[PDB]
Design a protein around this ligand. Sequence first.
Ligand SMILES: *[C@@H]1O[C@H](CO)[C@@H](O[C@@H]2O[C@H](CO)[C@@H](O[C@@H]3O[C@H](CO)[C@@H](O)[C@H](O)[C@@H]3O)[C@H](O)[C@H]2NC(C)=O)[C@H](O)[C@H]1NC(C)=O
Ligand SMILES: *[C@@H]1O[C@H](CO)[C@@H](O)[C@H](O)[C@H]1NC(C)=O
Ligand SMILES: *[C@@H]1O[C@H](CO)[C@@H](O)[C@H](O)[C@H]1NC(C)=O
Ligand SMILES: *[C@@H]1O[C@H](CO)[C@@H](O)[C@H](O)[C@H]1NC(C)=O
Ligand SMILES: *[C@@H]1O[C@H](CO)[C@@H](O)[C@H](O)[C@H]1NC(C)=O
Ligand SMILES: *[C@@H]1O[C@H](CO)[C@@H](O)[C@H](O)[C@H]1NC(C)=O
Ligand SMILES: *[C@@H]1O[C@H](CO)[C@@H](O)[C@H](O)[C@H]1NC(C)=O
Ligand SMILES: *[C@@H]1O[C@H](CO)[C@@H](O)[C@H](O)[C@H]1NC(C)=O
Lengths: 213, 582, 218
Amino acid sequence: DIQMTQSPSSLSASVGDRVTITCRASQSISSYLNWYQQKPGKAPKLLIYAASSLQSGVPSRFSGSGSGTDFTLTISSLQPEDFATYYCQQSYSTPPTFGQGTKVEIKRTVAAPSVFIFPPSDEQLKSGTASVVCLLNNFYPREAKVQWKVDNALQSGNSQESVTEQDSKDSTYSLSSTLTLSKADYEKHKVYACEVTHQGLSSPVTKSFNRGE
Amino acid sequence: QAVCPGTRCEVVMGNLEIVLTGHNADLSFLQWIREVTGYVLVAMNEFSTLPLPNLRVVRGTQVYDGKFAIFVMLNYNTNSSHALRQLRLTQLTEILSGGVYIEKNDKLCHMDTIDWRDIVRDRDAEIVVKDNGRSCPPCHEVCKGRCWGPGSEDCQTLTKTICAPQCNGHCFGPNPNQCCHDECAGGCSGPQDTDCFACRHFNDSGACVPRCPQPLVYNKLTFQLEPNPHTKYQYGGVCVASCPHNFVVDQTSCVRACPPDKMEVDKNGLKMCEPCGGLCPKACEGTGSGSRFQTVDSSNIDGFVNCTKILGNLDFLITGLNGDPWHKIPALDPEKLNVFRTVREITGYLNIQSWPPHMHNFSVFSNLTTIGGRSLYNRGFSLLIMKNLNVTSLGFRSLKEISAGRIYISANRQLCYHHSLNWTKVLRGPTEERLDIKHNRPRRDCVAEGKVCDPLCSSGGCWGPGPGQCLSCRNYSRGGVCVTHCNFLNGEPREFAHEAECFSCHPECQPMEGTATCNGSGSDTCAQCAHFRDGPHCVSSCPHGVLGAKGPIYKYPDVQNECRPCHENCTQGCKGPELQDC
Amino acid sequence: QVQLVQSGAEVKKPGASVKVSCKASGYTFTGYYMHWVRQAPGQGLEWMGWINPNSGGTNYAQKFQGRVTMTRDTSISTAYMELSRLRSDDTAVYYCARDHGSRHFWSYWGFDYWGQGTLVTVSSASTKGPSVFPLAPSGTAALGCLVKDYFPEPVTVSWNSGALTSGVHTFPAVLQSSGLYSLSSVVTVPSSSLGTQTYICNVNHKPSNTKVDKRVEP
Ligand SMILES: *[C@@H]1O[C@H](CO)[C@@H](O[C@@H]2O[C@H](CO)[C@@H](O[C@@H]3O[C@H](CO)[C@@H](O)[C@H](O)[C@@H]3O)[C@H](O)[C@H]2NC(C)=O)[C@H](O)[C@H]1NC(C)=O
Ligand SMILES: *[C@@H]1O[C@H](CO)[C@@H](O)[C@H](O)[C@H]1NC(C)=O
Ligand SMILES: *[C@@H]1O[C@H](CO)[C@@H](O)[C@H](O)[C@H]1NC(C)=O
Ligand SMILES: *[C@@H]1O[C@H](CO)[C@@H](O)[C@H](O)[C@H]1NC(C)=O
Ligand SMILES: *[C@@H]1O[C@H](CO)[C@@H](O)[C@H](O)[C@H]1NC(C)=O
Ligand SMILES: *[C@@H]1O[C@H](CO)[C@@H](O)[C@H](O)[C@H]1NC(C)=O
Ligand SMILES: *[C@@H]1O[C@H](CO)[C@@H](O)[C@H](O)[C@H]1NC(C)=O
Ligand SMILES: *[C@@H]1O[C@H](CO)[C@@H](O)[C@H](O)[C@H]1NC(C)=O
């Protein structure tokens, strides 16, 4: 189906840089390749069609090049409106195919997360469930590491994380790891803690609390 | 190569004109010159000596000032240290036509001593030598007052001979025993053909001959024309075994470019161009991206005439055919489309999006055979035929190879004959998703109207109806057209077969009734000769003057019509083996 | 102007059928082909098929060919796509896009105008309202709410009916193994105001008609 390969998967670049994403075709596809921009949660926007032709409305900094197999979408001097996800589409074969998509991210200095821990509420304990939340707020880069320790015991297969996109101003992420437990397990052990490992931290920070205290 | 044109070198094809060249120029590249066809012209020069130690003949096929084959004049300067002093022609011998004009050369010596009546063969040619050198020293004592310089080796002259009226104008002596050879332009040193100074016609390895060795020599062992391993070709008045490295052979002579009725071909080292089998190739411009024209219109169609190989592509859009009334263009005349019947190969692609309604078949592309696909019209297609609504069949009856690309044939709601085509046989390589055939005329309709591939075609398919439209036949074929039989035992031309293709027998085979006539194309494959038998070969007339290795061969016909060599002492040929028949 | 409007969000059970519409306006509807592209949550794009809005010709992808029927209604300029034989892997946001060429053979199949996107959630779970549980703090304080166990997406969380917007971070909903979504919404506030100002989070779940408020005290 002429599967498209985009490179790189993710990209960290600042405002004013020249960025370059590469869409590689499995077979020769002449010059039938398009480019798209998708704001998170919004409908995709057509940037360049026919490998190089610029769609009406798109600024002059957007330019495409290449033919056959190796294509390239080059934009010069990044602008705040241009931080989104970009896909390449082939129109050569009868089944069209899109790439995996490159996500350009705002470059930023390393910021440490503000770690907060939250015991489960009493209204939730009446239902028969306990959810412990470990918060990582306004940090950079995106990768973090959250490990739970219930009385110095490593947990697995029972916690889930969620990450927010880059903020429009300070360009920092936010992550929350929720540990879902039954009330029977929560009433067993005293000390709960999440261990956060990040680049912005000099050593893995651990926030702890005790049941009832 | 010892020959060099006129207007390192031994022969000069043209005039040798030396003017204005400086004093310090190395004139030694003229050391090997032997013969000059045109005239010799030396003027306005400043060097001291002319050196021609090997020059022997100036034929003077062209005279300057209407009278002279040698013209030397005013080779000096007025207020500098450069002027001509000597003409060193220690081996010069003869001039065939014209006179000699030497005048106003301030310090040219020894010209008054050499008798001019010897070199020039025209008696009443004007020979004048005045106001030349001044204080010239006398000629050397060894030379008897007949020299070209003060040296003791620069004095030939002599050669003067009277003649008997029998030899007319070409002789080496006065006695009746002293006629030069027939092939000698002027004088000779002996009766032989290798002793003459210049040849009337050609010089081959030292001898004067009428013509150079012929490419074909009759061989009395094979009773047939056979190639000659000691051949020579015509380059001017010199027989050479190989033309100059840039040249090409025409028939038996060398030429820089073959005439337009022949095309330069290489035959195992030797480059000669044969006559074209009808007409000669020619490359012309394409059409589309990379060409000058968006389409083929009435303003570019005349330039495609007589073209054989289209370096590019062909676009047939509606605007080119129907004209463009917005930008004044004449609509193309449809009967002029027949200029494409000469096309054989298309380098890139073929795009057809509109065709005249009265033409239901593309028969104007009959002799088209190859579509390379090095460039593609649109999406990866080397062949595009769309929205052609009033077209019945294709008609590419000699199309055999689409080297690369893909094929688009759709929306031709009246096209048939394309259904059973083995596209693997034409397009080379994968057929995985390289065929776009849809929305045409359905199979259900073509079979009902009787528009399927003719049952005379193989399992590959056909481009249309009839015999001459098959890819491959089920039995035989002739002239790109399938048949049921060759004309073996009867027919207008008696024919034979070679890998399922009929070829006409040799015309000298006798037409046999009820049995096979010939095995192959040569005359050694007839079962019986129609006229005469020259050994195993059938001939129209017996050998009567053919050139052999030992001499001309003369033969006579038998009562059973078999040529046999006549006795060694006939001249005018023979009507029989006896001496009375010469 | 050219604008494509799609139908509302749909929630189906594994095995049913969904027929999403795409109302076109602002151009010659029969002049340009209509493409259908879906995108799984947090995944790439996937082309399904195009429709010739003038002749009615279709061209479905081999993966979907057999259980997708896309049609047209030229009297109202509307295109329909009916994906039957639903699975849990068919949960995606289905966009409708317009081909940028009137003559399709010379088109480069570039989509210049898109719809707003129709979310189609296909899961075996049943429509359940959300449970709101507070997350109390423990210089700078941090608090939030926990919207746990609901179906289907989406929920709208706003603090103080929209009065407080500084520092609000509403995390994307994570899909649990039970088939329900869990969602957290934390806000950072000065520790001085912790106790002098009321902080209330407001959750609205349209599919279950659930509107719940919740105060958050230490
Ligand atoms: C046809 O052309 C050939 C080659 O151009 C001629 O062969 C040449 O024959 C002459 C004798 O007639 C040889 O000349 C000799 O040269 C020496 C200097 O090397 C000179 O001092 C002698 O007095 C003598 O003249 C010459 O070597 C020879 N050339 C070659 C390459 O073998 C031939 O004479 C020509 N025939 C006619 C009819 O013009
Ligand atoms: C010739 O040359 C000399 C010196 O080189 C110069 O004085 C004289 O004028 C020249 N005359 C002519 C006619 O060139
Ligand atoms: C094409 O070649 C033939 C050769 O016989 C000639 O007669 C004809 O005039 C040529 N065509 C044109 C347009 O000159
Ligand atoms: C083209 O085909 C015709 C047969 O219709 C033939 O007479 C003609 O000689 C061919 N032309 C060439 C250049 O072979
Ligand atoms: C092909 O064209 C010739 C032109 O004379 C016509 O006689 C013949 O019927 C045509 N055949 C088809 C199948 O269109
Ligand atoms: C073919 O030409 C005839 C002209 O006599 C016309 O009536 C007919 O409609 C044409 N067919 C198509 C498919 O255009
Ligand atoms: C023609 O088609 C047959 C199958 O019907 C195949 O076996 C054969 O190879 C094809 N011809 C060529 C030249 O490939
Ligand atoms: C040649 O023709 C005969 C009779 O027409 C037929 O039986 C035979 O199969 C043909 N040759 C081939 C290779 O099919």
